[PDB]
Amino acid sequence: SYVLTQPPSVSVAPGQTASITCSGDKLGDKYVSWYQQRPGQSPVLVLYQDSKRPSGIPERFSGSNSGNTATLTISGTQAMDEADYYCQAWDSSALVFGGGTKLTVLRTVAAPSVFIFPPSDEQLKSGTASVVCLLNNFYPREAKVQWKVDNALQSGNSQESVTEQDSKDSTYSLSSTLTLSKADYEKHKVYACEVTHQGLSSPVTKSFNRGEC
Amino acid sequence: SYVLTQPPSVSVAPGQTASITCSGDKLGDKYVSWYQQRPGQSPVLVLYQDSKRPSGIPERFSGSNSGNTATLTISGTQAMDEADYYCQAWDSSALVFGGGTKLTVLRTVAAPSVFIFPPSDEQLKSGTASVVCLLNNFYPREAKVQWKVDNALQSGNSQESVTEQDSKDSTYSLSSTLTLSKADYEKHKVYACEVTHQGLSSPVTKSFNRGEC
Amino acid sequence: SYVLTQPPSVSVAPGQTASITCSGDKLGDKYVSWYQQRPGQSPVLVLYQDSKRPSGIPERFSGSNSGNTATLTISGTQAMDEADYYCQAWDSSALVFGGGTKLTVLRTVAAPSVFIFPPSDEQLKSGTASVVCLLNNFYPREAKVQWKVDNALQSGNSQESVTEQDSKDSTYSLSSTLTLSKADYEKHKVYACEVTHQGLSSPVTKSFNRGEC
Amino acid sequence: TQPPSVSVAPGQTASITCSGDKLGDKYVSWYQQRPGQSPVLVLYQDSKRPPERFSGSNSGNTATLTISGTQAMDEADYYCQAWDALVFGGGTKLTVLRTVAAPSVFIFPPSDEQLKSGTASVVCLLNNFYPREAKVQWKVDNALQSGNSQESVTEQDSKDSTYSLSSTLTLSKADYEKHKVYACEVTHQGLSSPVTKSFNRGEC
Amino acid sequence: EVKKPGSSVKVSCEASGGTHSNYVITWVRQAPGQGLEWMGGFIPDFRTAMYAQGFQGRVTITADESTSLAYMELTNLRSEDTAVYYCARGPLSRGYYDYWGPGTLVTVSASTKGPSVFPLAPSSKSTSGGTAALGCLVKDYFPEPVTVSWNSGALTSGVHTFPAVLQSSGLYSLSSVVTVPSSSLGTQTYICNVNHKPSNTKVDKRVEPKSC
Amino acid sequence: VKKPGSSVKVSCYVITWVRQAPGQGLEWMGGFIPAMYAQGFQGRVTITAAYMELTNLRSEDTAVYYCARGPLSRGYYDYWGPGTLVTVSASTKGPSVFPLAPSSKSTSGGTAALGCLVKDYFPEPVTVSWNSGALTSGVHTFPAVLQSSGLYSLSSVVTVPSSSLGTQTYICNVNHKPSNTKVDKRVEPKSC
């Protein structure tokens, strides 16, 4: 029996190059071909006859076959290159597919930008105040916001809504509302929004006095 | 070589009887003595010749020897019986001490009794209020309180003081005081005091409305 | 308008007597009746004409009505008497239901009993070894089981199962079974089952040495 | 009136503003006071100075204290002096942050001679990283471990703020002879997710 | 199945077939976790009925003896009329209600109204970095969906539109935030374009830094 | 720690003095040319030569002084000399007793808690007795806690049978020798 071995997984960072090897016994005397498979999708050919790439695949992909190791080289890897890679070869009139290789790209950590917006003047005329604190682009999904009015932790009167990472990006974007009522917004001079997250050295607080805007 | 075996450690609650076994082949055929050693102290004699005891030892201490096992029986176990016990035996013109056995005397978990006393009607004339939440007898030291006024967890304006366990008991007593400015007390109808501790299935909260209803 | 009032909530521990009061104006002249409603069900009559009781209700229930209050007296409270009790009274040609009262029975923390059963010899011959740890008659539900094989915490390869709550006692049961291969079990020498749960001063481990017996 | 605090990264430009009506017409002096140390003048008469990283200006209603090439020894409390009687404004605090940095993790197998001595030592090393808080986990054949590993750490270099950590795992002989797969898992800020470096027993 | 607003419902209870009954039928409604209320009465033997004061105008109790069935018709349902409707039967003249029947769940879906737009003031403290975050708030509307576009759809670089969140009342809330350079805060006209098709609501709203 | 209300002196071109309370900033009082006084401390500062004297020390005078010297007519000061630290402590004030009313709701356990609260007293310690020492069962006296301002506080609590609330006289006896103070305060349930 014949077997082709590949590393279980590989890790790299954006803009770097990753090398995937499909090694074997005297594998340099055979024509290999590599298949890329995204999760939930059928495999799509990426390389046939070692290095002759098909039409449509970006030029970044490149491979070679020599000795007992055949390698696939990726340059400028991006968040769209995550997918399993499969090796192929013919032996003794028997097809052989190499073990699945999982190529992962580790995305960098970006700190959030946070703002606090007071309540519109018009809403107060309708007996309702809503202070909204926002967290701009930030990758690590784990985030925590804590509204403290006049330095008194609050809970049970806030809601959270988030979007999905941009296609050509990896950062979310979060926002939190604090639904209040008039005769409660009329007091507690100091209002604050506290956010904790990676990247930030220490929690950052953005505040605004109830008076003087 | 002659070797005796003892249990590694023994745990018993107060008011029960604890038995420690010194076992060995042909062990019961000879005379044994028990030594009690407290940490950082010269060991002392508690039993000699199975059941005979010396002066200065209370009637609680007792022991029996038979077969291939010697038992040290202690009645009225309390915190003063915390020490290590060793079994002695003679054989082949050579002494042999058994492995150390440690005695542990814990106290059963308790559940605190929590009271809340509104502020006086003589303080307010002085422009200050102080709501006090008291936790009564409870053994496990680890306890927590969380002042919630109008359903808004607070921090930074409360202190905790605790006494030491009584002589004939092992229960602490914790008091938590919340000092508020005169104006701040005039609002926030509701007041509460929450406590968490072992022996409570769920946290218990005692609250009193500001109206003194 | 005619309105009846009841305390929002009442809490008691098993074995004690709880009192619920429905208070109105000159309420002694009417013929109050009490209804018990468990969650997601239909109320069932429990008392009509103050004290009289229907057929199919335990003798514990008892009530009274005098002055300006009608009191429902419950004796020997147990876990099956947690539900909402409502007060009724006909007045001015218009039915009037009282405010909802919630009665909650506070449970008592009970420590678990932990055992470990080695893998049977015949099963070992079959080629797979299994180790099972049992915690029964414990409360609250939360409990964490952590295996150990020669001071090596185990991750994965473990199934967890929990039985239904017992109405009479309100105590669960949990079985954690560890599955290995024959050779892996044959290696290593020491096995243990660490349990951490409320009601236990310190974690308790029930270990055994394989092959010893 | 001065800002309560100012935070800037090393090598960056920071500005400290002292505000006041007619301050532009008047002059200003700046003093630096380290914790527990008497204040020392840093600038007088707007730009007059007694290194050259200090720079100040005074015009209109604001005087700016500008620093260039901020470094770890520039942290202090600054004050703005003016005459009107001597009036001293609220002090301002400046901090030198330094930025997060990921640790380069390495794993080395046990030498081929120690085995003849019946003892193996697998060492997992962490290279320069600023935030001291770090955590390593030795999981051999996918099973966490504890009680048989020691960590030693050095102090940050003079012209740097990065530590370095080495975790030595001592395995008794005839224990390293099994458990084909070894690994070292590390967690720390900057890393998006935990990174584990693993080596098979007899791969080469 | 959700009953549309302004419709009616019919709760059915067993009724005497035209002989001695020896029991008085009733009705009871229980809003979720809010207690019990009285609706109306009925005495099979005497065709007469008896309605409560609160539901005087919206209820009507009728019975049919051929089918041995009786029912009450409630019209002009509103969001406040989402609850569980019971049906009890007590003795003739004692007045305590017994043998409570299986519950019936009735639901309605609020109403339809357009959104209200309020502006979120931009940064007041001078941010020299060059990024001031604007945004208008859209809330108190029903049902899904609504669309927000900036400057008549000509600005789509940086616009964020967070998904709508279900308020406690039952309506919806939605936000929209755009980041722009600080230096271009007092020279360009920023306009929200909120459109809600079901209510045919089209409203603009200028957003400018608050005066100081 | 200097006694409050006493006087202290500081011994140090134009010579000036500046005071800096812990984490509060720099405070100027005056200068002297080998005199000028600030408006805030016009009456409590004396300059003689060179040294300066402060009188009527109070709580807020705890700070560190510095001897700074500047040119004749430059408008700036250099050569900030070593700082000299001072520490006032407080005025001695007696306690004020307030009652902690027992719960006005009957309890199935038949137990209620009473207590008198002592606060605004300096210096330590204080002693509390119930019914002239006639009651000493289930009595707790929590240790004193240093309040933020600089004074102290103390609490005492006793648990007694519920039925013994309105049929007995409970009095909190407090004595403070340093202020020769003795106050008795009755503790009774709130009227309703």
Ligand SMILES: *[C@@H]1O[C@H](CO)[C@@H](O[C@@H]2O[C@H](CO)[C@@H](O[C@@H]3O[C@H](CO)[C@@H](O)[C@H](O)[C@@H]3O)[C@H](O)[C@H]2NC(C)=O)[C@H](O)[C@H]1NC(C)=O
């Ligand atoms: C006054 O008398 C009775 C009041 O109940 C009315 O006659 C009732 O009509 C029902 C309905 O037709 C009849 O019972 C029926 O019997 C046959 C059996 O095949 C069938 O139609 C149904 O199964 C039903 O059971 C019956 O005549 C009678 N109901 C009884 C006796 O229970 C009558 O119409 C009333 N009014 C007048 C003006 O008489």
